[PDB]
Amino acid sequence: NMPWRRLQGISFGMYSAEELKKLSVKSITNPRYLDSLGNPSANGLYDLALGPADSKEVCSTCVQDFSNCSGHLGHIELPLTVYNPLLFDKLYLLLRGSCLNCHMLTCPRAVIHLLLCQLRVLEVGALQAVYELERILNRFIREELEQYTTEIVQNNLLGSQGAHVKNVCESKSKLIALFWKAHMNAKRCPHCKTGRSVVRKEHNSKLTITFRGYLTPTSAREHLSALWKNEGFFLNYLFSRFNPSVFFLDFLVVPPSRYRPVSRLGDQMFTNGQTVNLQAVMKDVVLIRKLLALMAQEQSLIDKLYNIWIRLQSHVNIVFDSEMDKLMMDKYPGIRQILEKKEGLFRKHMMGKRVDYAARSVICPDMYINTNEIGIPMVFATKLTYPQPVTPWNVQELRQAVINGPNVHPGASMVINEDGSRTALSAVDMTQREAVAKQLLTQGTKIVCRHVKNGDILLLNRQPTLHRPSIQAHRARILPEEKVLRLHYANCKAYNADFDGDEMNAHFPQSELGRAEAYVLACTDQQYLVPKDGQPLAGLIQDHMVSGASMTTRGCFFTREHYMELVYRGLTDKVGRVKLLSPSILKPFPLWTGKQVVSTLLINIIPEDHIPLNLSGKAKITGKAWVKETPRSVPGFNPDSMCESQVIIREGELLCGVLDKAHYGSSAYGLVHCCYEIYGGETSGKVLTCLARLFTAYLQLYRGFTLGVEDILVKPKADVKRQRIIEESTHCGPQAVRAALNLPEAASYDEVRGKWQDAHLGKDQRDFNMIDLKFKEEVNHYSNEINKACMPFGLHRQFPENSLQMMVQSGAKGSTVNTMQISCLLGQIELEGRRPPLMASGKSLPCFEPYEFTPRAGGFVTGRFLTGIKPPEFFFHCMAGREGLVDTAVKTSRSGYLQRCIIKHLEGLVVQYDLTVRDSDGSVVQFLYGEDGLDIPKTQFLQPKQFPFLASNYEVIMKSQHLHEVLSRADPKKALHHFRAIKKWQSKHPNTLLRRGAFLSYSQKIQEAVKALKLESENRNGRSPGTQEMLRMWYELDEESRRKYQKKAAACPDPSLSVWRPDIYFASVSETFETKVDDYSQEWAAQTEKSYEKSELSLDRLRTLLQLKWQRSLCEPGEAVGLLAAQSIGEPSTQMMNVTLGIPRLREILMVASANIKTPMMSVPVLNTKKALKRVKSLKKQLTRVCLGEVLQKIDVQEQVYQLRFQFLPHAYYQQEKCLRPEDILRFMETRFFKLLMESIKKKNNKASEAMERRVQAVREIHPFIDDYQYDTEESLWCQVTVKLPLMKINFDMSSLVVSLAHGAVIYATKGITRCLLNETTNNKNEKELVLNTEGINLPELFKYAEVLDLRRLYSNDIHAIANTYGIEAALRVIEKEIKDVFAVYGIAVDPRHLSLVADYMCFEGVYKPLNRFGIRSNSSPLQQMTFETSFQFLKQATMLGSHDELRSPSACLVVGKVVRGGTGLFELKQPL
Amino acid sequence: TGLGLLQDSGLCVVADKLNFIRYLSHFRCVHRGADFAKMRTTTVRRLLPESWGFLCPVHTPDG
Amino acid sequence: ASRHGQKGILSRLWPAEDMPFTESGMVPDILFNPHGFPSRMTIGMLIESMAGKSAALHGLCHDATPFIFSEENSALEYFGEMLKAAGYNFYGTERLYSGISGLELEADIFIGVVYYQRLRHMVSDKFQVRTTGARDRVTNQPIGGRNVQGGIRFGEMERDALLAHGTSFLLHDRLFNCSDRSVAHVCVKCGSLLSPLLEKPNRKYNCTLCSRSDTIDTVSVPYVFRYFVAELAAMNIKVKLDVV
Amino acid sequence: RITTPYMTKYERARVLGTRALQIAMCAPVMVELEGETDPLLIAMKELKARKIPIIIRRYLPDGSYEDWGVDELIIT
Amino acid sequence: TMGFPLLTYQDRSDNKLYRLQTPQSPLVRPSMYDYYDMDNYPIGTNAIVAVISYTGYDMEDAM
DNA sequence: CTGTCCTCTGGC
DNA sequence: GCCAGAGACAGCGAGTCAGCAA
RNA sequence: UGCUGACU
């Protein structure tokens, strides 16, 4: 009978220090805690009043033993006051900004009172009052602010419960942080100008006031006690009614002894790390108590008192935070280390507890148990026990279990009594078990702990759990004589199990209410589709794909007896007749087709009442794989009308198609995906099981699959071409490298080696990667030439009869990159995206000359695994294969952290009963989940191109799911009228960006006015002479209430999902779905007309069908979609050119939210006008940066009289694409470089111990060092300068300075843009597009070219710059597009409904907030936010603020032992009386 | 003085005769260092072409 | 495992009369699925099979030294000539019968002799089942080892993947009713877990801070939460909890 | 009165679990069981017959609730 | 690998020591296997392997 | 080994 | 008062099995 | 607890 009482809220505050007393059984005084023999020494840390530490003893405080005694608290009473280590830093500030003389803070009372009032208003939730108070102040003190603040707090009370929400915690956080950060600095005192008694704290345990005295915690305590008195009204709000006394400790609390368990350490049998810290405090207390007595029996004595104080304070620090004090040793870890880390106490024993009734063993392939079952090896089954209550309808089978005993299988290990408990049957006398088989049904009934009984439900987990499908429920099929847990192969891809030693865990629910959820929710057939993109997860693999593709091929004929025994061996049917087919060939000999075997297996599995399905699709095996012989042309035949590439199932009977991986597989829209749509998830599991069994029987009985050497071999007469191509490839190095260094086209054979060496020993190393790339391209051309010679038709056996092809080609295993690289080429090795690295001497391998041009020396392997690879190629291949593993390890290490952070922020977002996605505190993140509802897995067939399937299978879909009942219980008028209104509006307004307005609509008289009326005036008030006539005619010279130009200019009706509640309102669908339905109805009523088949479906029954199928795919209330978004962004990354890629970019976007990204960019289309195309050339040449260093030949420095001649470059080769002129360049030196030069000369010397004339004169007017430069009337011939510092300066090779400065000196550049470039083509549809990409980011510096470039369509990857020029609703879409483009480079595709939620959460509160440790500060849950990271900072915060927790997060709900507030726990049950 | 070493652990290890190919590989092992097992960057794991004939490309633990 | 990195567990012990027998009377003793080759490209196993079959046939002993067989002199050519010199076929395929239906399979199978090693990892050393047993005495949770009985750790990844199913009661079972579950009782007015104290024997828990015994009520709470409250009190922090 | 009329899958799961935990504690079965020893099969048999006197109390995010009958709820 | 670890039992008193009963010497082996006689300590057995898909229990790395 | 804090310090 | 100098400072995947020494 | 091996 449980306590029955539940928790609503947990608040963290500070204990008085006077109420801790009476929370204390006794004061401990004896240092030595371990007795001579290992027992507790009286009055020591381990005592018998602080509780029995072990079961041996009984506590003195309450007589009770271990395992039944809640431990008790005790206190080491300290000799003198010490500061508390957590409230210490704040104390320091409370003493830094304050007058020790006046005892008042040095802050202007304006700030004090403003912040006081803002806190008073925040305490009730009022959030506009904050800025209203601040503006009331600035426009104007206590009476001015307190009136408004009291009016708010009074008119807006009843909101103390509705104040624990994000956006109310962020504001208080920011206010108090800004206060502590900006207004607590040491300042001259207001009232007495000399009140800076500068407290300045050294390492912790040390505060020093000046006239350099040592602040004694008693003097600091009195200072705080007298400062509170003057400034309490203000601080009681900055700290909650905090007493200043809490900032100081007069005793330390020793926790109960049951929580401090003695283990062992080197050379010490009984020691806990926590007692070793508390023992050090007790030992210092004893030394200090002696010195005080020495003073009583009475500078060294008091210097010793001040030194032992500092030591005791570092001993009380270490007790709180092992690493607060770094100069002490024998320091075991404090409480900050007991709580805050991955080892910790939250990420272990709090979120990751260890569980009973669970097994773990190696998993083995089964395949002869149904896909929803696990095989249990009779050793778990005899130990795993479920507690079944005994009742009239089970007392018979329970009686057999208690009789069978603890060791026979349908048995039981124990039986729990009504009031007593735990009478174990494990005896093997077989008579007392019978003595107790009676007395069952002889209050709460006896419960028999029965064993696993062949129908039980078990949760199975594989340990890298990266998605929801990694935990699924299975049905306990008991197997005898094994120690392995057997699992079907359709459930492999879901877990990623591989049967190579693959331990897996099995959990056994014990509640009968978690069994209901394992059956209904966690079942393994509700898990058919992955939640990432809704595509199927379960499917057949390997030889069930090569078996089904070779049986469903056109030339497979079976006699009656192989037809049968192949149907019954796939079925193994248990009930009802087997419905057979008719022979396809009836005459020369009755024969079947193999497609008929699959057909007849398909019409028996589909449920009896339901009718077989129709299906049309494509096969994975291309119809070109079968073309042996050159194809000829028949005039009227479309070869694809009758091809093995088109799968056509017509009423459950396969009529055409091979049925490879595209069906039976993990590919969407196949046969099993449609089975799962029309008939449910159990029928798709049945289909998978039966098809696996059939395709196994086929290969095991009549056919066989193998992979010899005559299917990897290559024809002769085809290896001769391969050999000649490999011979040709050994001559393509010189040309490649040369034409990449832009060297003279020929005549240089040794200048090229020297240029390569220079590029290799260079500093930048980007003229070396150029050679690497332009060499890889040549080698890749050659490699592609070789594959074509051998792989398609140079093989000895072709695809229908090749075993390697037909394994990579039907999706069984491998890719076309594996088939090659086994035959005819291994390829070009690439380690970091580059060729193998060279040695320090210029050779890549000891076998190769230095700087060798042959591609072989760069990792181009022309050998194959058929005929092995030579030693040098072996080396490069090993380098690559090894970097692969290193990268795997590191990548997973980073992905784990990314996913943990994401999951720790988006976990509380669940769909509510009003279809709105709200967080734990009620903050609305989205008003409709995917922007339309419609969870992902159900929206797979609502795409167009899947309607011709729903139309074909209409009768099955209505009978099996919606039925005639729902179609006629639907009333669509409210939503249908809304769409009619929308359609009419959009009919009257084709261009929806045309500035509709009443008055604007009353500009059709425009000609009426411009004709003669307004011809006489000027711009009276800036508007116009002719605009005033329109204003006069409209204003009051129009009808009173019949001037209705308004209706012709009114807004579009708002979308239906917005007004008409998509769940309870029929026909209320999304504006993009109804368009698709209209298009398809129009393209389907014009197909029925020319159909030669009878269609008994009408466009207006298909419409209702689609509308019901939409209304039903609507994201059940309680879905917890934020966790699904987290896991869907995590799993693909965890598993898996001038921009960033991979997890670096994902972490830049999500976890960091940086304003500085490594590769910022832009892309504005070019306006498509003849003038724009001409102006853009100049635009590109205008924004590239030209730097003094990019235009210079060499300097000539002479040296205290230091001359300098720059000698600039000729315009032939830099004016072409930089838009510069020599007068501007030289003028730059006179005004910027030649004064930054003196700036740097002072930077060094501060810590060292007719017309030529006006230019020179003004220049030396401004500086006192220069003498005279030069002039160059002919293209900058000789332009030097002269300086001199005559007395004493450090004459060294100052060329260093004037060269380190002539690099970061840029003539002129647009801020933030480093280079532009016009990537000519970006489209094929409208190929005419041009894009001006950039590698910097300055949005406003492009606004000036709104006629050259399209400033709508401007894009940047920055997301902080977009959020500052266009707003936050425009940064949402940039975030979403960035995540999508990051995932796209790998072929991954996360559903948009997940990125929508992630972007809506990140940009919730007006700013692009990072999804990381600093984003949780604006979070309304202290118990969360401390289960993530920096748990001790978030605990100190929550403690000095009195922060309250509502126990509504998943973390706060799992910490205090509640039921999470999403999914199954979102409602009550309320049994009525 | 750490002996001019830079490492203070894993200096001696158990030689286990599970097989004679586990045993013979304890007297031919060369450990880059025990501290490098804790590093973000992986550049002491690159198999450079200067260990040709001195270290085996294939024989390296694979975790 | 083989000598080429093809490790795998033993999944069945196929009866000797259900194995596909060859036309020579033989019957394999290892069955190896042919789908580990296409993605792993261990073409050395397909050559070792032929080399070992040729060795067993001719009483020879061939060497598998790397880099001894070139493109011109291939290994498959060499060992297929060896096989064809023994009456077998070049490509190393002998045709089997089905030991279950008795019919000659349509495909001729690739059979040979390869050298298998047995690995030291056995299910007998890696299998665990726990029902009830020992407990960490600081947190009162399963102990966490296999030599000791020990429980398996559920984990935060598993806790976050189990509440994506909407199963809050499977989570309640695993994390609460199986690992740690206590009945620590609190003073309802003071709202403190440390305050209720037993008496000296009508055994009434009496609140120490306020002397009332009508205010104490039992709450079902984890044990690590009581440990957490105790170690917080150690720091003078107070956890005030609202009972309903 | 404004929430969806159907019974979400989480509600079906929790109602089956609670009805099963009741049946197992010796509660009268109003469904005429026919030899099955599983309380969850019996709970499904009862849910299919529309005999479950439980009141789903759907909570809205502001504390307001709506009390639906398990009989007056469209089970898919 | 479980093999033949040594010849002196009755003397070692190790903790664990895995022994294979009847090891054989590979019929196909590199010549270096014969320079360091590694047949004093064999490691496995020769088996007649057929590469066939026949059972339904040998898929995904199982044998 | 990276990016923000973030608390000085220091110069201006 | 404006914004570099830093100089701390915190984070760094999940699970599992042993042995040995202190 | 630690540290040295190892498994997916």
Ligand SMILES: Nc1ccn([C@@H]2O[C@H](COP(=O)(O)CP(=O)(O)OP(=O)(O)O)[C@@H](O)[C@H]2O)c(=O)n1
């Ligand atoms: N440190 C690790 C190593 C492995 N794992 C897990 O084990 C799986 C198989 O490892 P694996 O190394 O066998 C990869 P697989 O694709 O199966 O290999 P193949 O190409 O030879 O078929 C990985 O995908 C992870 O889920 C982990 O969580 N942590």
Ligand SMILES: [Mg+2]
């Ligand atoms: Mg594996």
Ligand SMILES: [Zn+2]
């Ligand atoms: Zn007690």
Ligand SMILES: [Zn+2]
């Ligand atoms: Zn003052």
Ligand SMILES: [Zn+2]
């Ligand atoms: Zn009380």
